[PDB]
Amino acid sequence: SVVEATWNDVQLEDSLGMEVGYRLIPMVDFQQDGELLGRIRSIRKKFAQDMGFLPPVVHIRDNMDLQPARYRILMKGVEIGSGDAYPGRWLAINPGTAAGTLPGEKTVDPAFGLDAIWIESALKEQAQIQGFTVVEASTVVAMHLNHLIGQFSAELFGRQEAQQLLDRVSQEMPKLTEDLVPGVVTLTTLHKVLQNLLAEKVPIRDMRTILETLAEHAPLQSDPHELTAVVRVALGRAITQQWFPGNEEVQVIGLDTALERLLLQALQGGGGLEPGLADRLLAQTQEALSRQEMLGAPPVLLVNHALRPLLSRFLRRSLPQLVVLSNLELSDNRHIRMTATIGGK
Numbered sequence: 001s002v003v004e005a006t007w008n009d010v011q012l013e014d015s016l017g018m019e020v021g022y023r024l025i026p027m028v029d030f031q032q033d034g035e036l037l038g039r040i041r042s043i044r045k046k047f048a049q050d051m052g053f054l055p056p057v058v059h060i061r062d063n064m065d066l067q068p069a070r071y072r073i074l075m076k077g078v079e080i081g082s083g084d085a086y087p088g089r090w091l092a093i094n095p096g097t098a099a100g101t102l103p104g105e106k107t108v109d110p111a112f113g114l115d116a117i118w119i120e121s122a123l124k125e126q127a128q129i130q131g132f133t134v135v136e137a138s139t140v141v142a143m144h145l146n147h148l149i150g151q152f153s154a155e156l157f158g159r160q161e162a163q164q165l166l167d168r169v170s171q172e173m174p175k176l177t178e179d180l181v182p183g184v185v186t187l188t189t190l191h192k193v194l195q196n197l198l199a200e201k202v203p204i205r206d207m208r209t210i211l212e213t214l215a216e217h218a219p220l221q222s223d224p225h226e227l228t229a230v231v232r233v234a235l236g237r238a239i240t241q242q243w244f245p246g247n248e249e250v251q252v253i254g255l256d257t258a259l260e261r262l263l264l265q266a267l268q269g270g271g272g273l274e275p276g277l278a279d280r281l282l283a284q285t286q287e288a289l290s291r292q293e294m295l296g297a298p299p300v301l302l303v304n305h306a307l308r309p310l311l312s313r314f315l316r317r318s319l320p321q322l323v324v325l326s327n328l329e330l331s332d333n334r335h336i337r338m339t340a341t342i343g344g345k
Contacts, residue, residue, distance in 0.1 A: 015056035015156060017074035018145075021066040023087060027138045028060045039142035047149065051198070052205040053165055055149050055156055071141055073148055075155065081148050083110045085141050090127075090134050092119045098131035110144040154199035162191035169207045176211040185218045185227075192224035193231060200312060201323070202232070202239055209234050229309055229326070236329040243298045243323055250330065251297040253288045254338035260304055267306060273314070282318050284342050289319060291340040300325055302336070 020028055027036045040058050048054045066072065073081035084107070092102055093109050093116040105118045119127055124134050135143065149156065166187070170177035181187050193214065194204050204210065213234040214227060221227060232239065244250050255263070266273045289299055300323040303311055312324035330336070 013077050014059040014074065015076060015158065016058045016149075018058055018060040018141075019063040019066060019072040019074065020060060021068040021070045022062060022064065023068040024071060024085060024141075025062055027087065027141075035136070036138040036141055039138055040145065043142060043146045043149065047146075050203070051150070051153060052203045052207075053153075053157060053161055053194075053198075055153075056158075056161070058145070073145060075148075075152060080152065081110065081144055083141070083144055085137050086118055087137050089118050089120055090124055090136060091140050092117050092123070092127045092132040092134050094132060100130045102127055102130075102132075110140070111147040154195050157191075157195050157198055159187065159191050162187060162194060165194070165204075165207070166190065169211065173208060173211075176208070176215065180211055180215045180218075185214050189218075189222065189224050189227070190214065193228050196224065196228040197231070197235075200316075202235060202242070206235060206238065209238075225309065229305070232326065233328050237331055239325065239329055240331045240334065243300050243325075244334070247333075249335045249337055251292070251295070251339045252300050252302040252325075252336055253292065253340045253342065255301070255303060255342040256344065259342060259344070260307065263307060263311075264304065267310070273310070278314075281315065281342075284345075285315055285319060285322070288340040288342050289322065295339060297339050299323055301342075302327065302330065302338075 018028070026032050028034070030037075037060075044055050044058075063072070067084075069086045070084055071082060072079050089104075091109070092104075093112075093114055095114065102117045102119050102123060104120065107116055107118060108114065109116045119134070127134055166177060166181065181190055193210070197204050197210075210231055213231045217227060217230045221230070263273075263277075266277070285301075288301075291297075292299055299321050301311065301315075302325050305326045305328045308324055308326040308329075312322075315322050315324060
């Protein structure tokens with residue numbers, strides 16, 4: 001080479017990163033249009049004002065070993081998504097209810113997994129009237145990215161984001177924070193609590209409700225996996241209205257009155273549930289999810305309060321579409337109807 005090596009040649013890893021084939025460099029270019037840098041900003045914005053924290057910056061670079069119209073999406077180094085995106089062309093997507101077909105590459109949308117076909121420019125308005133939904137090239141890469149952020153939002157929430165959320169709270173209600181951390185709760189513990197909440201799709205906008213439940217129940221309990229289910233009920237009115245809007249009936253999934261005892265028998269017994277039970281649940285749990293799909297009902301499971309911290313810990317690494325709530329989290333002012341059931345068949 002020409003210039004001598006300095007420590008500025010050390011490229012620290014990126015929390016979030018994109019790699020780009022040379023055909024896409026225009027849409028990600030500082031200097032030219034930047035048609036996708038705009039979309040990445042409005043993702044990160046409509047995530048802070050929505051999920052309750054700022055996703056880390058998306059470091060975009062190119063990699064000439066990538067096919068020309070291809071991108072990779074990266075977390076802490078390791079790929080977590082890739083796809084094709086063709087600039088001058090558009091993406092006709094089918095929600096299931098479009099009439100006809102179109103000429104072009106047949107493919108599947110990288111977000112929703114829907115069936116979709118890349119089409120050329122002048123088919124736009126003609127593809128829409130057949131019942132399609134046509135997004136720009138740049139918008140597909142946006143779609144794929146806003147999906148993976150919501151999917152990994154727990155892992156993207158590092159100690160550096162906890163300390164940054166803790167500064168943003170501690171500039172609108174400083175009295176809570178000034179003595180809650182590092183005094184009564186340690187940032188390690190506050191961070192693990194918010195991360196547990198993000199992990200189950202519960203937003204952390206209500207830091208009053210959180211930092212108060214913690215400042216109250218902390219000096220007699222320090223396990224974050226225990227302080228979490230306490231905070232969960234503080235946010236019960238909000239978790240309720242999340243999967244069950246309006247004031248109408250609550251269509252939940254239920255487990256058998258003895259299956260409960262079956263599982264509840266295996267709780268206090270030790271740090272382990274027994275094998276054979278497993279594969280039975282996951283098939284039986286997926287039986288209940290399907291009934292709700294054809295009914296038009298949410299995918300929420302309502303269980304005993306000591307039975308939630310592990311059904312969500314077990315069932316969701318397999319069925320992440322599942323919600324696992326608690327009798328003590330659901331509001332009193334609602335009517336419940338166990339529409340589907342997890343029994344012995």
